[PDB]
Amino acid sequence: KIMDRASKIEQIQKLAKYAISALNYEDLPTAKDELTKALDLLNS
Amino acid sequence: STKDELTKIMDRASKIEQIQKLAKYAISALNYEDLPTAKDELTKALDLLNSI
Secondary structure, three states: OHHHHHHHHHHHHHHHHHHHHHHOOOOHHHHHHHHHHHHHHHHO | OHHHHHHHHHHHHHHHHHHHHHHHHHHHHHOOOOHHHHHHHHHHHHHHHHHO
16 A cells, blocks of 8 residues: 555656646647646545 | 747746746655645646646
């Protein structure tokens, strides 16, 4: 469960990195979806 | 208004950099399992992005 949660946190961090990358292209819809997914995941 | 449009490019651009910075801060916060901070940062990032 500890390692599991740590992986969930890794996934949130990865999504945030993906969003940062998308924004280098001003790819707003991609970054919106990735941030939304990171937030939904962090909530649950 | 070349200058005024450049101001806009710089401002919307400043907003995008702030969104990226908030995401970076959230990544760092999560290294400390600091969920409330990361949640606030991602929320602010998403709100700023929706304003563009």
